[PDB]
Task: inverse folding
DNA sequence: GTTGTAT
DNA sequence: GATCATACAAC
DNA sequence: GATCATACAACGT
DNA sequence: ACGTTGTAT
């Protein structure tokens, strides 16, 4: 088996607790809300095949942002750097570092928000990744949890439950992103007023 | 590789997660309740301060104490947010009627932030006590906290119309709210007017409630927008600064501004004015020196050639703002764009429920005490026989049963008789109990009468509201023009 | 300008302010009191947790609440300092015997910080309860808090020698303390030893207290430094990583670091080693993997063939923190002044403090028992002459005259009479008297016992020994740090 | 007075361009900065925050001294210049007041600031420009601060006067010097514990 | 940009 | 402690 | 929430 | 001259 040998320069982000493997068909990358969950993930993850990337705060909604703002933001930049895929006119899916990208947002509502933003980013600027079926979402039973709990409940493949993100139709998808995330407020308010049970 | 895997449609998870976040932000974060005019963080701060015993009579407690208790018990979020809220509830230029009284640096009008929590202490304001009046008399429904090991009020009694009085803001998901502050007395007059004549209109209401009363003061231009606002829930009004052009000892002009509009920074206006000055837009000005003290408020001097033109420019450049009424509040779980009448009616009904619930609590308490007192009176009337029964008994159970059989008592009465101190077996003690009992009878009669008559409840509301108006209301700060 | 302008000489104000800050840091921030081995912040976190009711039995409470209370009531500094202190006393690799149980991200050995206070909750560890045991029996003095509206303990009871056992550090002004952690059972054995044979030499003490026992373990080189330290308070010893040489399935040597020294970061060692390797200042290294799992430490340095793993190992011991030094500077506050203490002096201080605590406790219990017995006598007389009592009461208008006549008649005190007047009617049953009698007799026995204990120092000493033995029985560890020559 | 319109991040300046009346208050942290600035009479009084414990220059290298941003901010505000530019006749404030917190850490910061001033702003202290405020500090209303320690017609101030410069240099070399032992001896001698 | 509850 | 990005809606 | 500079002693590199 | 340790600004 081929493994890393330390020593390497790599030039990967200052965060990112990378794994000890080099096989982009066994390794995983957990996107994590803050270093509060970052520590728990990093210290109890089987550091042979599981990497941890802390995204800080609410990631930029690309639908409501200029491309000049997108290419400027360093969080998305760090994510793309961690994937080593490339941006837009350089996006090579057959040159990724992880074929299993787990979205491990917090279990609160703001976590759902971050998950949403991340999904927009992934569908709008990492589309082949979702198309190839690399994007997974963790389904917990995070900073308020121990190492052993985090692992034994959510990260151990022998006892964890995960979801593969698979698109149905690209039309309905694009429309949904254009509604929930697009700058158009009124249709979104209509959606929330017609599809919410208080 | 996983053992147990499941498929997840993109649009599905997107929809579910988004609806979750949106709903949670609308009905539990960004918007206030129409009844008490509070959003979760503020309500939790007021209640947290209540349980902490930082009432206006008691001395202050450090901000870290309050923030700590509030986060640990009720508000499952960060320190900075809670403390920011508390600070905003203690600034004269933010809240028209401050709900928090604090010591130490709590920020200035000029954008300066508050000092750290380890330097500032705080307690409730005198008027916030009205928000918390008779909370301990089952006037308000409670719920388990996030940890489900504490309990917190869903709403507050709010004995003054906090929503209209202190206003609201702002941004949520798919919607936002904006309500200006109002003079206490006028809002109370409006409530009383709605209670007296239900067939009232918007104009009639505007007779005693001219418009917004901003903590900074200043002026409002026009009234049509105000009427459209109070009538429809959404409108637009223009705001301008309160100024005066004095005369120097050199014999020149001197345009001095004394009152800046709502949510307007004098410092930022200074910076922007200078920025516009080094761009040949505003000529004539000699020097712009901010001369505000801790006793009051900003001098802008001009030269020969024109002060009126220059000030008109200084107003048409930035000094002049647009308030957009979008009175949106949570009502019965769902959010709504409410008129003036709807807010007023909601608050009135809430007040009726509070007063009625309180009266019921007092009723029950009084009646129970009366029952026990009947028991005790019987006991003192048959002291020797009672003590005979008690002594003859071996265990307190058969004693209780024997007392209940002999003197025809309830379990509560017999229990109270058994739990009687010896020192209350004196002579003058019986009479005192009799007096307390009679007073209790009168009380119960009065409360039952109150519960049998809605008119009395309404009158109680009006009286107490009038007392709040007398105790706390300020003179009008904002002058309305046309 | 001004009006009232005083004049200050530079050297004067300098010396004054500096003496101020210095003394403040020395006596109330940087150095621990020898008796309980605690700094003000840790003592305030423990006492604050006690008053919070987050004892071992009771469930956890949010960290921000604990720190909020500690700050507001006792510790007038940053929230960050308090939370950091607590988090530190919750870490097994930082505290030889943790004084705090935590939940959630409380940090890692790799140097990762703890989670924000709005995620983590905490409480007392089962052993800290011994640090606080019998706090409510006047075993310890109290003083006003900074706000002068609360009260705090000057020192804690500390029913285990926390200073030596947990160690201390460090930096003051003009001084700096450094004490290594020790094994519980061993330190207790040394304490009992000194208690029994007071003419014991340092060697005799080392026969049961061989030396430091660090939370991570590792190895110690040079026991001479240990003896010199225990005899003087100052001394230097060597610490080396517990390592072993393996063989890959491919046939070449492999260095396996399993235990790192005290206060040494694994990750920092990894980085230092990498920087040393990609600089050719160290040669022969094939790989550097960190294989530590949440059940053990495994730091792997794989060597190429035709290269000695021993040379690489010793070069790592020389160039990296895989081998470091420890400088015993056993310094602690005693009698309000900073002192450099020998082992025997520290042990003596602890034993004295312990005697004070035990004697105080016994006195408290005696006073309480005697009071309750007095009141019980009153109640006995009343419950005997109930008719007469009730008659005197009924024939009384004021309560003052009732009390006065009860006292005058039954020859009682004011307290007793007040107790009689406060009697519930249900206490006049037939089966109530006998219970009070039994309780009274038991109280007599107890008072006799406690009086005997206060009369004899030997019984105090013995009690200390036995309770120490129980603490050790309940909490002691197996040794981790191997001492070798 | 000035005229504004002209081109540190902190430093709430005054209004009068007169280094004979104007005063610079060195206050610690934006927590004290808020109150001090809120009640300060913005004509002849400006405030300068000193975030964190200032660098001990008696133990630091010139490379690190010139690097420190706080010292650079104090020298920028004072408008004196540094080293071979220390033009005392170009100072911007007639009174450099040390207004540290009323705790021991505040006294420490007072010592540090006094070392900085004595060592690298010697003409300023040698000409009676340096003062020490006398509070009875973020735990204070702006009106409280103004009425107590910032009002000229009231308040008490200490004028930092230097006697024997040899004694000064000695004490500075002893307390804030590189050597630790004399500091330990001084602590052992001039301190009453119990 | 800025407003205020949030990560 | 101070200082940094950003979601969200509405000028 | 994450990072950033500093006092202070003592040792190291 | 730097780093590194733990309570502080
Ligand atoms: C502004 O001071 C601090 C700095 N800095 C000092 C430097 C100069 C100014 C700006 N840049 C840096 C930031 C820092 F890096 C950390 C902390 C810090 O952790 C802390 C705390 O209570 O935990 C408190 N303070 C303040 C109470 C002193 C810190
Ligand atoms: C790292 O997130 C935050 C940022 N940043 C977001 C940026 C993106 C990545 C690089 N770091 C910057 C700094 C910020 F500027 C402010 C706050 C903040 O004020 C705050 C709070 O509770 O008051 C909480 N957080 C918590 C979400 C962690 C903040
Ligand atoms: Mg924030
Ligand atoms: Mg800090």
Result:
């Amino acid at each position: 088996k081929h493994m890393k040998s330390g020593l390497e320069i790599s030039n990967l982000p200052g965060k990112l607790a990378d794994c000890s493997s080099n096989n982009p068909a066994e390794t995983e990358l957990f996107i994590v809300e803050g270093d509060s969950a970052g520590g728990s993930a990093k210290s109890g993850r089987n550091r042979e095949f599981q990497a941890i990337l802390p995204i800080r705060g609410k990631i930029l909604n690309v639908e409501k942002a200029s491309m000049d703002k997108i290419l400027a933001n360093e969080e998305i930049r760090s994510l793309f750097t961690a994937m080593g895929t490339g941006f837009g006119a350089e996006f090579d899916v057959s040159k990724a570092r992880y074929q299993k990208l787990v979205l491990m947002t917090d279990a609160d509502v703001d976590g759902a928000h971050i998950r949403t933003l991340l999904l927009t980013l992934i569908y709008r600027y990492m589309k082949p990744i979702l198309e190839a079926g690399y994007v997974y979402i963790a389904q917990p039973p995070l900073g308020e949890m121990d190492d052993h709990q985090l692992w034994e409940t959510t990260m151990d493949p022998e006892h964890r439950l995960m979801a593969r993100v698979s698109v149905d139709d690209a039309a309905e998808a694009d429309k949904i992103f254009d509604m929930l995330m697009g700058d158009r407020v009124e249709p979104r308010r209509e959606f929330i007023e017609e599809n919410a049970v208080y | 590789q996983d053992k147990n895997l499941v498929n997840v449609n993109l649009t599905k998870e997107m929809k579910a997660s988004f609806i979750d976040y949106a709903m949670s932000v609308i009905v539990a974060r960004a918007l206030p309740d129409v009844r008490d005019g509070l959003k979760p963080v503020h309500r939790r701060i007021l209640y947290g301060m209540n349980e902490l015993g930082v009432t206006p009579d008691k001395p202050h407690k450090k901000s870290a104490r309050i923030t700590g208790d509030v986060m640990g018990k009720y508000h499952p979020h960060g320190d900075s947010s809670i403390y920011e809220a508390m600070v905003r509830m203690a600034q004269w230029w933010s809240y028209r009627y401050m709900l928090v009284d604090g010591h130490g640096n709590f920020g200035s009008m000029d954008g300066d932030s508050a000092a750290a929590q380890r330097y500032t202490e705080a307690r409730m304001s005198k008027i916030a006590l009205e928000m918390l009046r008779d909370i301990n008399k089952n006037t308000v429904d409670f719920v388990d906290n996030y940890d489900a090991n504490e309990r917190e009020p869903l709403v507050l009694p709010a004995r003054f119309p906090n929503l209209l009085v202190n206003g609201a803001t702002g941004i949520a998901v798919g919607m936002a709210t904006n309500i200006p502050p109002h003079n206490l007395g006028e809002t109370i007059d409006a409530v009383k007017l709605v209670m007296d004549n239900p067939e009232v209109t918007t104009k009639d209401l505007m007779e005693v409630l001219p418009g917004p009363d901003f903590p900074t003061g200043a002026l409002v231009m026009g009234k049509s927008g105000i009427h459209k606002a109070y009538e429809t829930g959404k409108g637009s009004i223009v705001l301008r600064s309160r100024t005066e052009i004095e005369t120097t000892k050199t014999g020149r002009e001197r345009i001095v501004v004394t009152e800046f509009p709502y949510m307007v920074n004098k410092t930022k206006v200074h910076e922007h004015i200078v920025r516009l000055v080094q761009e040949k837009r505003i000529e004539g000005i000699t020097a712009v020196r901010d001369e505000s003290n801790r006793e009051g408020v900003f001098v802008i001097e001009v030269k020969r050639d024109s002060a009126n033109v220059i000030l008109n420019n200084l107003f048409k450049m930035t000094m002049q703002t647009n308030f957009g009424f979008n009175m949106l509040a949570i009502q019965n779980g769902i959010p709504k764009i409410l008129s003036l009448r709807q807010i007023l009616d909601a608050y009135i009904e809430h007040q009726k429920e509070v007063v009625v619930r309180r009266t019921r609590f007092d009723k029950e308490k009084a009646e129970a005490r009366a029952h026990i007192l009947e028991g005790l009176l019987i006991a003192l009337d048959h002291i020797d026989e009672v003590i005979r029964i008690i002594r003859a008994s071996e265990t307190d159970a058969e004693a209780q049963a024997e007392l209940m059989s002999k003197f025809k008592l309830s379990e509560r009465q017999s229990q109270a008789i058994l739990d009687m101190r010896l020192r209350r077996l004196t002579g003058l003690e019986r009479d005192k109990i009799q007096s307390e009992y009679d007073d209790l009878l009168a009380l119960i009669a009065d409360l039952a009468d109150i519960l049998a008559k809605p008119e009395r409840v309404s009158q109680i509301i009006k009286d107490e509201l009038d007392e709040v108006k007398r105790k706390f209301s300020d003179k009008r700060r904002t002058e309305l023009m046309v």
User: Anything to note?
Assistant: DSSP finds 17 helices and 18 strands in chain B. The pocket of magnesium ion (ligand 3) is lined by residues B 80 (CB under 6 Å). The radius of gyration of chain B is 30 Å.
